[PDB]
Design a protein around this motif. Structure first.
Motif, PDB file in Angstrom:
ATOM      1  N   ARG F   2       0.834  -1.183   0.000  1.00 38.30           N
ATOM      2  CA  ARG F   2       0.000   0.000   0.000  1.00 38.30           C
ATOM      3  C   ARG F   2       0.873   1.239   0.000  1.00 38.30           C
ATOM      4  O   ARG F   2       2.080   1.183   0.248  1.00 38.30           O
ATOM      5  CB  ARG F   2      -0.971   0.004   1.170  1.00 38.30           C
ATOM      6  N   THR F   3       0.230   2.359  -0.287  1.00 40.12           N
ATOM      7  CA  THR F   3       0.879   3.627  -0.546  1.00 40.12           C
ATOM      8  C   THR F   3       0.327   4.690   0.387  1.00 40.12           C
ATOM      9  O   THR F   3      -0.704   4.507   1.038  1.00 40.12           O
ATOM     10  CB  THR F   3       0.663   4.037  -1.999  1.00 40.12           C
ATOM     11  N   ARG F   4       1.042   5.807   0.442  1.00 40.07           N
ATOM     12  CA  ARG F   4       0.714   6.930   1.303  1.00 40.07           C
ATOM     13  C   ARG F   4       0.355   8.144   0.471  1.00 40.07           C
ATOM     14  O   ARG F   4       0.816   8.300  -0.664  1.00 40.07           O
ATOM     15  CB  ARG F   4       1.879   7.312   2.189  1.00 40.07           C
ATOM     16  N   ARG F   6       0.247  12.199   1.665  1.00 40.44           N
ATOM     17  CA  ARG F   6       0.541  13.055   2.812  1.00 40.44           C
ATOM     18  C   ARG F   6       0.698  12.237   4.089  1.00 40.44           C
ATOM     19  O   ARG F   6       0.289  12.656   5.174  1.00 40.44           O
ATOM     20  CB  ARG F   6      -0.537  14.116   2.994  1.00 40.44           C
ATOM     21  N   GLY F   7       1.284  11.047   3.959  1.00 42.76           N
ATOM     22  CA  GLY F   7       1.403  10.129   5.063  1.00 42.76           C
ATOM     23  C   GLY F   7       0.187   9.269   5.310  1.00 42.76           C
ATOM     24  O   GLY F   7       0.301   8.253   6.009  1.00 42.76           O
ATOM     25  N   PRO F   9      -2.725   6.541   4.870  1.00 45.05           N
ATOM     26  CA  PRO F   9      -2.585   5.252   4.185  1.00 45.05           C
ATOM     27  C   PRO F   9      -3.580   5.119   3.047  1.00 45.05           C
ATOM     28  O   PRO F   9      -4.750   5.491   3.175  1.00 45.05           O
ATOM     29  CB  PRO F   9      -2.880   4.237   5.288  1.00 45.05           C
ATOM     30  N   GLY F  10      -3.106   4.576   1.936  1.00 45.43           N
ATOM     31  CA  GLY F  10      -3.964   3.895   0.999  1.00 45.43           C
ATOM     32  C   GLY F  10      -4.290   2.514   1.530  1.00 45.43           C
ATOM     33  O   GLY F  10      -3.695   2.026   2.493  1.00 45.43           O
ATOM     34  N   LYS F  42       7.339  -2.192   6.439  1.00 45.33           N
ATOM     35  CA  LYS F  42       6.145  -2.084   7.256  1.00 45.33           C
ATOM     36  C   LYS F  42       4.879  -1.926   6.421  1.00 45.33           C
ATOM     37  O   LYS F  42       3.791  -2.258   6.904  1.00 45.33           O
ATOM     38  CB  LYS F  42       6.324  -0.903   8.198  1.00 45.33           C
ATOM     39  N   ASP F  43       4.997  -1.429   5.188  1.00 49.17           N
ATOM     40  CA  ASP F  43       3.871  -1.199   4.291  1.00 49.17           C
ATOM     41  C   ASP F  43       3.561  -2.400   3.388  1.00 49.17           C
ATOM     42  O   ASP F  43       2.815  -2.261   2.415  1.00 49.17           O
ATOM     43  CB  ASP F  43       4.134   0.053   3.456  1.00 49.17           C
ATOM     44  N   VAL F  44       4.175  -3.562   3.653  1.00 46.14           N
ATOM     45  CA  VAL F  44       4.026  -4.772   2.845  1.00 46.14           C
ATOM     46  C   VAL F  44       3.379  -5.873   3.674  1.00 46.14           C
ATOM     47  O   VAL F  44       3.515  -5.903   4.903  1.00 46.14           O
ATOM     48  CB  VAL F  44       5.405  -5.229   2.319  1.00 46.14           C
TER      49      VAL F  44
END
Lengths: 261, 256, 216, 56, 217, 47
Positions: F2-4, F6-7, F9-10, F42-44
């Motif tokens: 997932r993506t950010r 402005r910080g 979360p998507g 951490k985003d995976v």
DNA sequence: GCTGCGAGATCCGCTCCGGTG
DNA sequence: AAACTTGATTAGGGTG
DNA sequence: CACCGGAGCGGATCTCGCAGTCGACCACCCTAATCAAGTTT
DNA sequence: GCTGCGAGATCCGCTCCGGTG
């Protein structure tokens, strides 16, 4: 130039120079340097594109003499009268020649003429009329006009057109005349603007204010987040921020930053 | 040689020997010789004052041109103290010339003599030149202002003195990031180079000269002085034009 | 860089001397009473004071090919090429610059009491507010070019020196007596390069063992 | 030759920092100062524009 | 991987020190007598026995930010990141970790005599019995992540050739200059993998804005 | 992954291949844009 | 986390210029 | 009764 | 088949000992121990 | 009528033998 900046205030609080000398030495963006001087109480305790324009009569020819306060670069053109509106034309053209940020002048009519001030506003300039009190600028400007009339007196016999010879003094003084290692005030200004450009492409993100949380490391051990404070100078992989504790600019790698959106 | 071409220009536009050196890369002693010799406009050159700050007699030195400075804290303004001071002062430099005023230790005969032992131009007189005098004043005012910043930061006064000195000499900059020290070093570069390249070699000599028309040698002309002898050339004023000329030594007859 | 072109243009019975820079595209204009030589002498004096030309193009028109004009380009020391301007690369930019000139004059001139204020406005729009590529305006390009000139100049002036040190390199063991004179080929941090004369052999020489010198 | 030992100190200082000149007939002062001109950052920094290639 | 997060939590007057793996979602938890630094030092010694941390998140609480707790993290050679908890990526996992945890505790604690027995129960449900995707448990995701981090995986990569590339960056389609050259970190399809020297950032570059650099011959 | 923004979360995205792991972040293809991305560890979630 | 090179007298390896069987 | 704590001023060891 | 590498021998180079045999004194900077006075339980 | 030389450890060059495309 994240690294240079904390280090430069560190030099300044010690040694108390111009924001100039810090900008030039440390290779930072200058307005941080100017901020340091403004954030150096000492140089506020003891006290680019900033100008002063003084009408001057040489041989019954009103000469509107713009004097850049830092570089010593100058402009002038023969003006028919001291009218507000003719000066409005001259500052429109002249603002087309230069990129003046700011101005000094006296309270004479054309400067305090209301639509002139509305026009300096219309172009986004800070115009300050007042009895100029600063020997920094006033020595430069007095000297400027002495050299002006003296060199006009040299050059005008060589040219038919007094306007051509007015351009003559502009040539000799802003171009031919140099100093030091070869600094004409023109080339000084050219440097000032080119270095204003590269900050200027950074400035677009700076004018919008960001805040951030920030931290630092001890032996790599990250301290707790600090701030919220402004994101002072955006770097590549980092920024600058001030320590509220020490009153000092500080670099923080983006890893050790959280921008506050 | 750039020197006669620079002269051709100054005869036209009449710039500063500063800007003649800078523009043309000519010597500044050459450039100064131009401005002295150009009737239109008609280094290592300094000034001293004593002054008191917090009841501290402090010698001063201010270069006239780079603006760069020297000073020392002084016990008294007397001759002999100064004499040693200017021994060392000379010693840190290669001073050619000076201005000062008529004060006793300055005008002092052994001190003046001592210039002559150094073989140097001393000029005392009520210093009249607003070029210098403003700069002198800026020096004192700026300086003691900078003491007023710095001296609390220092165990030693003369440490702090060195501090103010550093600020003005060095840490302060102007132009392109030029402290006066930058300026001075550059000045002494080309000036010691012209000095070594020119002054000690030969003095006060005349010649006959010619110029070539499509390489065809002109008549022998002059006699006129050899103003700056070059490497393979010289510098001479053609009397009729009121203009200086590079002449190749082969087109020179040196008059003994 | 600092190569310009002039053309006279008529915008509503107001003669306008149009200076056009070839590379940056930074422009200058000023209102003109007449196309005569003398008026152009004043304009190119002032202009030469404001801009620092190397060189110029123009047509063969009277003011440019006028004698004291040409003499004045030499007295100011510009390269002045009069002739039928033939170059599409120039004349495309000249033509479009005139087209956009009267375009934006026709935009701004209602907004301004004086017309010279208006044409000044157009100069501002094109020189400054106009932005393209990655967002640089013409005056930025030009200022960058003027700077680039002096960059070339100083960079040369340090290239001109060719300094030679004395060194102490190799020969049996440890440190020998001083050697050279051999010139600085390249500067390092804490070292340089030289040649070894005897072996013709370039060497990586730490400044611990290097004394620097003017060859003369 | 001097009133002062320390003016004589100045004299020695003078001489060997200057008047001692050798090889090409140059002081140390020559060389320091010269090198300060060659120690300049800008011409020194200006040269970045010149091309790099890599090589193996 | 091995990037974990802690938050203490009280469940019915029982402090529970809840370890949260930021990727697998695997957790460890235990009933804790107090939030003290010293007890926590013991807990993370046990936990560093049951797990192999590289790195950590937590809040700034007294136990964690405590000096000898930090010295214990370094004694074990772990990256201890203390902070105002500012991330919704991981704090989503930690929020639903504690919510789901207290949920499952509230399920199992009647079913067992001891709360440590039932707490262990919750750990079993959420680590082991909880399954997702193709039926992988979060504990399975952890073991898989750990199993795939092997330096025999480093060995094969070390055996391989590297090739180099210039690169540029487009802004509004306006291509930047060729830069570097740099390593190809990885060959992609229509792209590759590189790092920015300037920003020290892994970047993908389209193969047209790649110039593949020729090898020696 | 997932993506950010402005910080912020998507949502989780993928599943998509594990292509090149780096230090702290990896490489996947964005199937949406047909272009590869990089995602903090951490985003995976690996599978 | 650092290192003997420099001042002082002598002498061979060379060239430029002058004398002459 | 017992203890515990701090400001200046002298005894040793390493560089000119 | 020429170029490079490894082992052994020869030529060249830098530093120091024999000039008896070694130790006091001044000045500055850094490190450490004890008396007079002030606290408690 | 009297004058600095030799021992210790490195560093480079020359010679013999062996490997490489």
């Amino acid at each position: 130039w994240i690294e240079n900046i904390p280090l430069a205030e560190e030099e300044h609080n010690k040694w108390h120079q111009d924001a100039v000398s810090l900008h030039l030495e440390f290779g930072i963006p200058r307005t941080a340097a100017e901020d340091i001087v403004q954030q150096c109480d000492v140089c506020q305790e003891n006290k680019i594109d900033h100008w002063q324009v003084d009408y001057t009569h040489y041989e019954d020819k009103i000469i509107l003499v713009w004097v850049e306060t830092n570089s010593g670069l100058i402009y002038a053109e023969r003006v028919k009268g001291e009218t507000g509106q003719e000066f409005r034309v001259q500052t429109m053209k002249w603002y087309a020649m230069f990129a003046p940020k700011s101005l000094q002048s006296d309270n004479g009519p054309a400067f305090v003429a209301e639509s002139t001030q509305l026009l300096m506003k219309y172009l986004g300039i800070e115009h300050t009329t007042g009895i100029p009190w600063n020997p920094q600028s006033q020595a430069l400007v007095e000297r400027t006009h002495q050299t002006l009339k003296n060199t006009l007196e040299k050059l005008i016999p060589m040219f038919n057109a007094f306007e051509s010879a007015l351009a003559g003094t502009l040539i000799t003084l802003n171009i031919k005349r140099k100093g030091g290692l070869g600094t004409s005030p023109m080339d000084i200004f050219i440097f000032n603007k080119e270095q204003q450009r590269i900050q200027q492409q950074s400035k677009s993100k700076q004018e919008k204010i960001r805040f951030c949380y920030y931290r630092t490391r001890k032996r790599g051990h990250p301290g707790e987040w600090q701030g919220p404070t402004q994101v002072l100078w955006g770097g590549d992989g980092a920024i600058v921020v001030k320590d509220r504790g020490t009153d000092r600019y500080l670099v923080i790698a983006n890893k050790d930053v959280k921008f506050i959106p």
